[PDB]
Structure 1
Amino acid sequence: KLARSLRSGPSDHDLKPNAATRDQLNIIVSYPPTKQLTYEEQDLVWKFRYYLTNQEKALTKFLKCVNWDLPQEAKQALELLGKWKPMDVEDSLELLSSHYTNPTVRRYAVARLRQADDEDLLMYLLQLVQALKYENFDDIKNGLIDSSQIITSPLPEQDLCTFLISRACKNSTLANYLYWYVIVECEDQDTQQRDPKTHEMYLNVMRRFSQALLKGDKSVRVMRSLLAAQQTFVDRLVHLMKAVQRESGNRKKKNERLQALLGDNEKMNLSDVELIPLPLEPQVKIRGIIPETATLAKSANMPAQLFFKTEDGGKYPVLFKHGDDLRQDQLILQIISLMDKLLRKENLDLKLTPYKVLATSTKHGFLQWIQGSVPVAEVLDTEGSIQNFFRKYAPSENGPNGISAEVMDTYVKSCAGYCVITYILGVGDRHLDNLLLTKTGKLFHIDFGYILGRDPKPLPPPMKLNKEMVEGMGGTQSEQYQEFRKQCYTAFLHLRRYSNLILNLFSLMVDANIPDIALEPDKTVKKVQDKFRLDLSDEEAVHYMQSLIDESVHALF
């Protein structure tokens, strides 16, 4: 009941803990970021605050122990904040969560992020746009309406908002994602209905972003008109989808309405435009859609498969979905993209396919089409087995089961990567139509409708493996199966080392209207944390991951 600062003031700047207390502190400081500290642990961290200033990891624990309402305590806390060994860029993300409200703490977080490369920011931007919900809305407003018409209707100590707009003005890729991430937050009907002040803050972000662009030099002013061109392109694509959906008849009559409307550029302006960034991948500039190859994909939703002509004379296939919230897929593909990058940083390239996903609204968006990919179901239906498929398309005399050594190496690696990633992310509703293969050996998952332990069945296997994948490698007695097990436990150990970053990213998503998070927001981070088995040592994690694989594979046969 007596304030921590009253039970220990600045007089004991010289406290050093004994051997036992150091071991207790090292355990508290190593906790996952959203594990609740007991009052006793918070007292212990407060007590040895001056000692803990030498541990950058300890600062996030320390700031959660402060009574920010007690002026003298906040004063002492902010003095220590200044003295603290500066935390890592990755680790600052935690201070932009809902659990920190102190403006000096939130400004210190942004000052740490400022040290990051644009490559890193892009990897965290989906979550930094969520983090705006925890900023000071009044300060956002003081920086200075249909959100989709802001960018198209030009008039004739940083906080998070100021920082994101400043970095976006210098980097066209960052600008592109910032634009589309904020548009989707503005179009969110639940935010509009349940949280009008939050909707208003996101409108204010977009109006500030527009004004910063209109104030910039020639290059920066052109960025605005390129965002405007993408916005009006997507608006036309949506108009076109509504027309094709409003057509009575069958896939063939619908496909002719699609090709006809794409074919009329004076009407729709979709087949022949000045180079615009592809919203899905803005590094790729597009000349327009090829009308005569456009068709509806064979599914219930009937997304348009569209081929974009690129500035370098390539074709970039996408799906455009209308009447579908892509945000859950967008988050999972962004996290797989991050996991893939962390594995490559540690020199493990597991030949993953983090294909691009962008919501252009809560109701429509793009997915990258991986050209030459086929569902495993189709590989089975046509060639009987994965090994038959690989023998037909990548044969090798002196190679495993007569298959190219490079293709089998790619297959083993990608099977391992996806078995560990789909296990960590608790991906459900796995079957041979949402498992895809390429002729280069790449296996990958699509359609992330069930995540974080959800499944159509109540007790799904924790490891998402099937008989056909293992027979693909040449069964349980092959060198390839051994190499698969080794790559699984290696990948698991590497991702555990980034558990602080991955759990902080999910922490920043608990207020996003992503269905499988919205179900149980307060339980979301813990469901990811448990999969890392952070109660186990590295050696025990290896044995645990081998049990999971052995038990899953034993049951399959």
Structure 2
Amino acid sequence: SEESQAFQRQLTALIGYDVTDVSNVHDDELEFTRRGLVTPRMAEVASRDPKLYAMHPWVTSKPLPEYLWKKIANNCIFIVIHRSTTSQTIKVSPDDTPGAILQSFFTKMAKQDFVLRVCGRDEYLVGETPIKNFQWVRHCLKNGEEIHVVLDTPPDPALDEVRKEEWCDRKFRVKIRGIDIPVLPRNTDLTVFVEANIQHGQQVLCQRRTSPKPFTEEVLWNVWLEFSIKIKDLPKGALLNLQIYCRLLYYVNLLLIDHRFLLRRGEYVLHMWQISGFNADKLTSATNPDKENSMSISILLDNHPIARAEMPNQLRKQLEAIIATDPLNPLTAEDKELLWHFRYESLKHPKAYPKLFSSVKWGQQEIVAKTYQLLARREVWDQSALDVGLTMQLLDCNFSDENVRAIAVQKLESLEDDDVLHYLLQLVQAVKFEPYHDSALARFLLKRGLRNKRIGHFLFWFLRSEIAQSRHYQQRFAVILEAYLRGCGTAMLHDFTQQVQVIEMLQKVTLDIKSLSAEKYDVSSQVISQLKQKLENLQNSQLPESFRVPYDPGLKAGALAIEKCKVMASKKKPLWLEFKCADPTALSNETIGIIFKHGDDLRQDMLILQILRIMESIWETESLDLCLLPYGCISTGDKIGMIEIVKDATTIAKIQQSTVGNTGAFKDEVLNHWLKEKSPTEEKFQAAVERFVYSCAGYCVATFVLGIGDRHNDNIMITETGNLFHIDFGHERVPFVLTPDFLFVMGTSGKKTSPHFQKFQDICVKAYLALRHHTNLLIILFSMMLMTGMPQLTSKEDIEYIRDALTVGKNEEDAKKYFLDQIEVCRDKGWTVQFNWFLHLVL
């Protein structure tokens, strides 16, 4: 069961999707996959340390960078500690453990076992790691801040409680019967054919078509389409893609071999996705749930089972050439046959694997077996250092083979939770490329979130983001998420519930507000009147007392600071909300600020941000900080989500709008003053100058690589404390925004050099070639990003921006003189394109 069916309503309402609904399924893959996951759930649930799980200590094995060792001049560190408006400061050794520090203190107060929390956060310093290796610590030192700790008793694990569970030789052919759309888009007698492809990693094996007929709401052929491929020459995860043309209009897929290794048979009525205008949505095995409006297509199957010598110089070298190559550089057939003939030598090169496996005639069963025997002797891969870029490459759409994909995941198993988070978003996206629901990668995500609450948390929001916005993949994700929620344990089930109700309330309000102020660049008094009036009517008796901040899960927000809440000036109407901090042990009356925004699809922003944090960890590997500000942002539902407000920052635009704010005029010395009025000391000013030269330089490089460099002033921000950063990614050319104002801070005006500018270029080029060292990674992540994150994008030209941008093939010299002349465009242009946003208000 009775209660056992409430849980299921609870789950469904947390998901925003019903994983018991069978209204849209032509088989039992999803249900089977729900059944399949209980073990690996119950596995990880059964084996997780309960107290450690509850404290989710957030921790890294990575070394402390050069820059933060210079921040320590005494091989020793200061930690204040409190009990009840009592507090003392302790000189700690950077290699000291929490448990070890309790000895130096079970010395002090009084002249059982307790634990150290951070003041204000539901973040703990526990377990056998040195303090140098907690992420909070490295955070405090970066910005130059005290470490504040309170001793309370540990979270009871009985709070993590988990609910008890309760579980041929024929050629291939296919009768195309016909199509059916109830209402026709264009009407004027047009002409229409079907196209049926057999697919395996956008490798196409065979293709057949139909005789085109008149496009009326019903079209019937009744034909057998005999393909070139043999039944026994079919691989697992081959898709029967079916498409409609006159040109592309609808598409749909059927996995030819099903999740039991069974050849697929019988009649299918399939409701088709319509094109808008390659793309992961295009890959899905899912069918359109809108049965009333959708094009659909009947078909039929009656087709059972199934489950050296020494190479010469000038060829080794061709091979090494081929292997050295980037991921997006396609293989000649000459190349592919080469990789094949010399498969066993290619096997000694882990970088060869993507290439080598995209050199398989997956359409021949004989070869795939050989390929599998090739996977047997994996000594060289199994023992190789984890290369994420390489690993990821084997997870993208190019690869559809169960076993290939699974070796990549084996490698991931060896990531620490730190790195899991880094790549979590993109790993969660990669599910779209899996041919089946149930998958080693799925299973790997599932595990690791059940293992660590932080991952678990982000995994929730990531899967929820996609479930709510996408019909192509919501069934699949929904299934995985339910699998997660069933083992995260009650505590979180409450937290998640808290969180969901709040963000569901606040989108009501968000949208309600757009309705009122039409476009009109002003926000009527009456709007704020009612914005305010609702937030009262929402706290009154309905909202939660408190809740974790989805983008920063250690922060529990409390009540709203209504006084300070508003709408923003946008053509959109975003909300500016501020909350009190539920956690009264916290140090400040400094509110929690969140923007809520309908209008742009924030999945894209999420992605750009995550990439941004990767580039940052890349610069960690050359001991480099560039002071990016990849603020918090979470996609939550349809063209809507939330954003961290960054305290004490304004818009580059607005810094112009202060002294002037004219109908579009710009001055050069103005930034520089905006810093001095905000820099109490003059030392701090030149620091603020310092922070900017980093932030500017990094944002210049990163933004050029991703190809999002030409922005408005309005969509760039600086902190009162010198930290520049771009925003609003959901939104003559110039490679990036290095304006004349940015340079008069550097001591230069359009055509000179200086002590702080010389510096800027120094950093830029160093940052730039640093990323070039991790080229393939950035290529693979961008490519996938485009494929999972975007509109439609040309499966050559859009994806391929980034290799011309990372100046591939080229030497650190040529490459530098590339990036350098990129700077001497913003010099020539200057205000020229900043100038331009507005004028085009009429062109």
Bucket of the pairwise TM-score, normalised by the shorter protein: 0.7 to 0.9
Deviations 1:484-533 (A, max 9, x none): 11111001001111221121112323443523xx2435433211222101
1:363 equivalent among 617, 631, 639: 639
Aligned to 2:802: 528
1:37 equivalent among 331, 338, 342: 331
Matches within 5 A, 1:288-437: 288-310=559-581, 311=583, 312=586, 314-382=590-658, 385-394=670-679, 404-427=685-708, 429-437=710-718
Secondary structure in structure 2 of the residue aligned to 1:501: helix
Asked if the contact 2:787/2:793 (under 8 Å) is kept, the reply is no
Aligned to 1:441: 722
TM-score with structure 1 setting the length? 0.83
Aligned to 2:310: 15
Gaps of 5+ in 1: 2-12, 141-157, 214-219, 451-458
Greater fraction of residues in helix: 1
Q: Post-superposition shift, 1:248?
A: 6.6
Asked if the contact 1:326/1:359 (under 8 Å) is kept, the reply is yes
Aligned to 2:88: none
2-structure distance, mates of 1:23, 1:228? 59
2-structure distance, mates of 1:387, 1:306? 30
The residue type equivalent to 2:332 in the other structure is T
1:253 equivalent among 526, 549, 559: 526
Using the TM superposition, name which of 416-425 and 440-449 deviates more.
440-449
Gaps of 5+ in 2: 1-204, 206-307, 660-668, 832-843
2:416 equivalent among 114, 117, 120: 117
The residue type equivalent to 1:114 in the other structure is E
CA distance change for structure 1 residues 405 and 23 in 2, over 3 Å: closer, same or farther?
Answer: farther
Asked if the contact 2:449/2:455 (under 8 Å) is kept, the reply is yes
Matches within 5 A, 1:455-470: 459-470=732-743
Matches within 5 A, 1:446-485: 446-449=727-730, 459-475=732-748, 476-485=752-761
**How big is the alpha-carbon RMSD for the aligned residues of Structure 1 and Structure 2?**
2.5
Aligned to 1:155: none
Q: Post-superposition shift, 1:358?
A: 0.8
Larger radius of gyration: 2
Deviations 1:27-48 (A, max 9, x none): 2112221221111111222233
The residue type equivalent to 1:325 in the other structure is D
Deviations 1:152-205 (A, max 9, x none): xxxxxx6111211111112222122222222222223xx43xx4xx33222322
Aligned to 1:541: 815
CA distance change for structure 1 residues 446 and 464 in 2, over 3 Å: closer, same or farther?
Answer: same
CA distance change for structure 1 residues 64 and 460 in 2, over 3 Å: closer, same or farther?
Answer: same
Matches within 5 A, 1:66-77: 66-77=360-371
The residue type equivalent to 1:230 in the other structure is Q
Aligned to 1:279: 550
Using the TM superposition, name which of 65-74 and 165-174 deviates more.
65-74
Aligned residue pairs, count: 499
Asked if the contact 1:132/1:161 (under 8 Å) is kept, the reply is yes
2-structure distance, mates of 1:248, 1:98? 44
The residue type equivalent to 1:203 in the other structure is A
2-structure distance, mates of 1:135, 1:248? 44
1:127 equivalent among 419, 426, 429: 426
Q: Post-superposition shift, 1:396?
A: 5.6
1:231 pairs with 2:500: yes
The residue type equivalent to 1:273 in the other structure is E
Aligned to 1:58: 352
Aligned to 2:536: 263
Asked if the contact 1:510/1:521 (under 8 Å) is kept, the reply is no
Asked if the contact 1:336/1:354 (under 8 Å) is kept, the reply is yes
Q: Post-superposition shift, 1:300?
A: 1.6
The residue type equivalent to 1:483 in the other structure is K
Asked if the contact 2:600/2:730 (under 8 Å) is kept, the reply is no
CA distance change for structure 1 residues 211 and 395 in 2, over 3 Å: closer, same or farther?
Answer: closer
1:488 pairs with 2:764: yes
Asked if the contact 1:17/1:48 (under 8 Å) is kept, the reply is no
Secondary structure in structure 1 of the residue aligned to 2:743: helix
Asked if the contact 1:245/1:254 (under 8 Å) is kept, the reply is no
CA distance change for structure 1 residues 41 and 470 in 2, over 3 Å: closer, same or farther?
Answer: same
Q: Post-superposition shift, 1:265?
A: 5.2
CA distance change for structure 1 residues 64 and 437 in 2, over 3 Å: closer, same or farther?
Answer: same
Secondary structure in structure 2 of the residue aligned to 1:430: coil
1-structure distance, mates of 2:817, 2:542? 58
The residue type equivalent to 1:287 in the other structure is G
Deviations 1:346-368 (A, max 9, x none): 21101111111111112211111
Aligned to 2:463: 182
CA distance change for structure 1 residues 63 and 248 in 2, over 3 Å: closer, same or farther?
Answer: closer
2-structure distance, mates of 1:549, 1:363? 35
Asked if the contact 1:326/1:362 (under 8 Å) is kept, the reply is no
Aligned to 2:293: none
Using the TM superposition, name which of 476-485 and 43-52 deviates more.
43-52
Aligned to 1:5: none
Deviations 1:314-363 (A, max 9, x none): 42212111343212222111111211221123211011111111111122
